[PDB]
């Protein structure tokens, strides 16, 4: 059980300030103890929404009122809710390759879903123009899984597309947006939007811990009114978790945490890439490593993706292949996550990966 | 802001062992710390499901394997999931009066929903037989909101009905089942079921705190296989909350807690009823007070339910009327919850209620 993790679905625990999180929980609990006997406001505790609002206004430039926000026990429960606010007959469009779980959720809900190939600037506007969908689902900070950072130019083009005819919506999934390495960070589509066509979605799974189960989305005014007319919804995110998060943010512990992890992840990513190129004698192609907590590696080998993956598991290496992200040759590509990866495991993990790819 | 609560949607905080809960969280966290960097198993952490299983086998006689269980960030997210496992065209049947939120969820999902009146033994089997639905939704321990305890005889009758033709399902919502006052507790429908037609649903909102957001449901083998074929679902209940709950149960703190609250709620309910009958000079009818954390009171007054409710709010009394639970004269009826009600507020609250009903 000496497993090494190259997983893209994990967070670091070694440097997570668990004692501070617990201290924040105790403080938040004793301050709002009486409210724990009742359910949360359906959109989430107001003070907590206000704290997330100020945060994402500062870091992503997002423009909204806390009343527009809905928390949030996972992006999927929010997405589920979102599809019930949007027109029932809406045609969705997802990036290809992309998030298969969300693709499956949409298809399972009976929705028509188009897939849009990527170019060097991310989600192809030419393909969007051609296929004429209603609702875009896009990951601009770090394309999931390819890692492409959508430049401002393509962001404008998508925004121009949504604004020119009505009933066009853009779901901006800002997953993995906290960490941009040696490029400046870029404002959210939502921030650049002048016509309120963007639904901004965010999560704390990467910046904190995925098991905390706190996510959020920001609704355009008209979709917010559609939400309010339901009236039966209940909040799914834990009240204690909500209150703790607010204290964590407002006390400066979150900013302290992000500052530390930003440096840590950057140094670890650099060490890992140096180790990969040294072990593979530079016979590897690394893509999508300018932001986020994973990148893509292509190998020059006759071994199939499946057999490499099969051998990796026998080597107790947790790793996934690019075919996981197909919605619909001789260079297998894998996703290399490094969030959970222990610094002390870099060389051992990279050596195991070499044996998985080549057989020795 | 001197509010008194007769709410049925609350839990006691004054006697909740918050320090023990926190001690259990710290212990659970340090024991399973490494797992917090990954997402939970989609059905919930296995050890946590096993702990809930043993608990509900002991207290409700429920018969299942942990593999059948799904957690659980609220009954509504589980119900949502359940309707996607059941036949899409299934005709549901709910108790009338009943849980309007769930009625709205089902209707919003495009489902046909019948309503079934109650008799002295609860959900009428004669009405069920007449209307011929597919899926029953029932609250046997303490009918929501009427408080009627479904006797074993009616439970058998419902079970016989589901077993006699295929594609008949019973959703057993065992909300408010922890506390039965001066009657013996009764085994769940699920426990008496010989044909695997029951979906058992439970929550910790009443026995712990509603803001913890942990609920669960137990699926019949065939519905479990239907669940497993989706494959894209993610867990919605917090991992820390899950792990804490397991430690809370397995350390004996839960049993200790339930023992204490059982006595506390029983004594408080008795004091409240004595206060009500004294203040209203016995001109009140109390119904559904043999279990659960609320009962029903009918008043002899010309004031409408709405005007009584309107005056109550001006008196800073949190209270709801029976019409809240209509899915589709001269004796207004209110629901009196007492979970959150402070012992020291009984007389002041009962005096405010008298002024709301009568005007002085
Ligand atoms: C594309 C994308 N968007 C959001 C999330 C975060 O979801 P939660 O808010 O934490 O529930 C993620 C989730 N990623 C883990 C699953 C990746 C996989 O390969 O299945 C995401 O990918
Ligand atoms: C009938 C019924 N079943 C289950 C629940 C518990 O739901 P959670 O697991 O806590 O999400 C409840 C919920 N009750 C509070 C709402 C009552 C109302 O008047 O709206 C319930 O009623």
Curated annotation (Swiss-Prot), chains A, B:
Modified residues (N6-(pyridoxal phosphate)lysine): 206
Required cofactor names: pyridoxal 5'-phosphate
Protein name as annotated: HTH-type transcriptional regulatory protein GabR
Entry keyword Transcription: yes
Positions spanned in the full protein: 107 to 471 of 479
Organism superkingdom: Bacteria
Purpose of the protein: Activates the transcription of the gabTD operon. Is also a repressor of its own expression, both in the presence and absence of GABA. Binds specifically to the DNA region overlapping the -35 region of the gabT promoter and the -10 and +1 regions of the gabR promoter. Principally regulates the utilization of gamma-aminobutyrate.
Keyword Iron-sulfur: no
Record lineage: Bacteria, Bacillati, Bacillota, Bacilli, Bacillales
Molecular function terms, GO-annotated: DNA binding; DNA-binding transcription factor activity; pyridoxal phosphate binding; transaminase activity
Family: In the C-terminal section; belongs to the class-I pyridoxal-phosphate-dependent aminotransferase family.
Coiled coil: none
GO BP terms: biosynthetic process
Keywords on record: Activator, Aminotransferase, DNA-binding, Pyridoxal phosphate, Repressor, Transcription, Transcription regulation, Transferase
